[PDB]
Symmetry: C2
Subunit: 392 residues, 2 copies
Amino acid sequence: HTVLQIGAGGVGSVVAHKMGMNRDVFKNIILASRSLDKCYAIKESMLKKGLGEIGVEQVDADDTQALVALIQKYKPKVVINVALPYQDLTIMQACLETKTHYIDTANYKFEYKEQWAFDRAYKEARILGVLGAGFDPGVTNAYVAHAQRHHFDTIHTLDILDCNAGDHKRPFATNFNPEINLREVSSKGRYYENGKWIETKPLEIKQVWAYPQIGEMDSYLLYHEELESLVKNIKGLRRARFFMTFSQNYLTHMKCLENVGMLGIKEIEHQGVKIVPIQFLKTLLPDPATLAKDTTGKTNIGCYMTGIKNNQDKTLYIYNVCDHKKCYEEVGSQAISYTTGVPAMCAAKMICNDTWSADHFRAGVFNIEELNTDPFMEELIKQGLPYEVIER
Amino acid sequence: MASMHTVLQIGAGGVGSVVAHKMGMNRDVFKNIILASRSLDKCYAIKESMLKKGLGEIGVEQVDADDTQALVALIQKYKPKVVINVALPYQDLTIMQACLETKTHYIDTAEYKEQWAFDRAYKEARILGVLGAGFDPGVTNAYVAHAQRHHFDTIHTLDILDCNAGDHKRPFATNFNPEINLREVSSKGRYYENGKWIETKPLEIKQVWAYPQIGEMDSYLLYHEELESLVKNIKGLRRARFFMTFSQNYLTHMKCLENVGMLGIKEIEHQGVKIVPIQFLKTLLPDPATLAKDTTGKTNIGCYMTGIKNNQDKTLYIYNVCDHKKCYEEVGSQAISYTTGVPAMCAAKMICNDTWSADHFRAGVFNIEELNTDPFMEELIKQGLPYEVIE
């Protein structure tokens, strides 16, 4: 089979690389992006690693008509959106117009409104739209769905816990555009409890949590995309929360940068030239491609649920641990891009071998917890993202 | 008896405003006060401020202090008795040259090699060259000289302790150009002990010291200009060290700023435009003139000496405390610019009423500890910087 991937960033290189590891399913792989240089670089690494050749194209993902012509040129079975989060709606519309299947990952106050509003159109066109096929959201959605059907009768509470304990060996550096980092630590927290959404102050709710294979880490309450999906799609939920770890090193740096004005979004005039501080910060901080080679450590993402099984109390903790350096030696990217990009390729496999389909019974726009997670989880294990359970 | 005189001041910054204001408080000495700078805006701001405070009128002139002939023409126009250099620190060598060419007396506030090389020329011209008439150097040099002749026969140890305990009410802000700040915390430390100069790691030697009217503050060992002159001019010195306070808040910011590359001095390309990181930091941070109105707190600068007076161990602590808000209410600047500029005006007064003179072999280029500090100290008390002695 043949698939079209739009995006050649850190997460996009994992999808292309891992796709090249499964050449029994993905016969022809085509990559398109605004930056042609990044595409050929991904082509080279895969060629250097003996995974075959990839097709390379340039495309403006803000232009639906250019995307439609691109899709019609290669006639792919599914299009993977690993590009910018503002181009998700023009890529979704192109998939609709061209009657091709759609997957997105890494979409970064977010709402599912406009992506979900394509359901009726996607249904009437007999195609599938899988939203958030990353890790959080994505595999975490599968973890909750996998526990609804194999480990619980009723789920009362859910806590999603994201921990990155990697060391890039630099004093300070980000793996994403600094605006991501700014968003994480400056936005109000939001969680769901007893039919209401509760908003908090930025990093107002702290807690220490024991992450398997890592240790105890300071975990702060944040809002995440997946909460919206899960709260709406899992009935009977009494509490839903998302937690991410932040070290005191990192938090102090961010508060100092905020105090000098280096986290600014509005531009300011310097030497007759308008500059955006956070954008200057991106130029200063090391290029994330060079951080991958040196980064060491582990990540832990998973869900901790309390529910009821056979009218007896149960608590479940499904989680995955990923080793930054192990990812770099396998594909050449770090664990944040690996945990986000491997599910995307697994979702693509599930559509190309017809496990996940829009044919017959149902079609439309779905989150991963609405689909058959059994073959997805088995595929995640085979491709390098095995999970661990802690049941009590 | 004393004659009224004309003074030419080159510089209209924080220190330059204090010097101009303080000269306008002493109209028995300074009949004409002329201010010159590249920025007429800053000069006119000082002019208005003084008029609002009933301190008189001043003369304002535009000049590029890198142009010796432009400086010479200004001196010849006004024929001032002394020229006070509170301008940019690389322009002192051109201002000294103009003073030489016009046979006029020179004062500045901030190695001494190239500045000391004017000694022969200045002697031949029968003019005076007073270097470092700020607080440190300046009053601290005076403190050591004043203790050398009134409190000690031999001075064994000298520790200069500079403390700024003011709160500018901002999360983070600097009182000068960020390159100063970078030098302060990134340069190796240097001190003198038993005839040798010792180099240290940046902020390697810390110590807690209780500064009168402030409290205990973390003091770090640094190098300072004055050590050069003082070690050479104070006979019998066994140790000479300079200490400055740094809060953990400030230090934490500097360590973070240095880690992202925001303390960089080499240019980097950003969006096809070559940028100097630290210069961008100066644009971001509050303009230091806007901090004076909000600053509260105190400063403590002084010298701590242990020596010998008629074969008995003695220790002395001469120091000055200054209130930021009290300074702003008087002249409109904060205490860091107040402690630096008031000595400069006093040094100008010592030259205009002839306490400090070039007549009768008294000429050449000097540091404050090489001069008659007794009327200098009396003037510092009168002008707003009284000191405290503790034995």
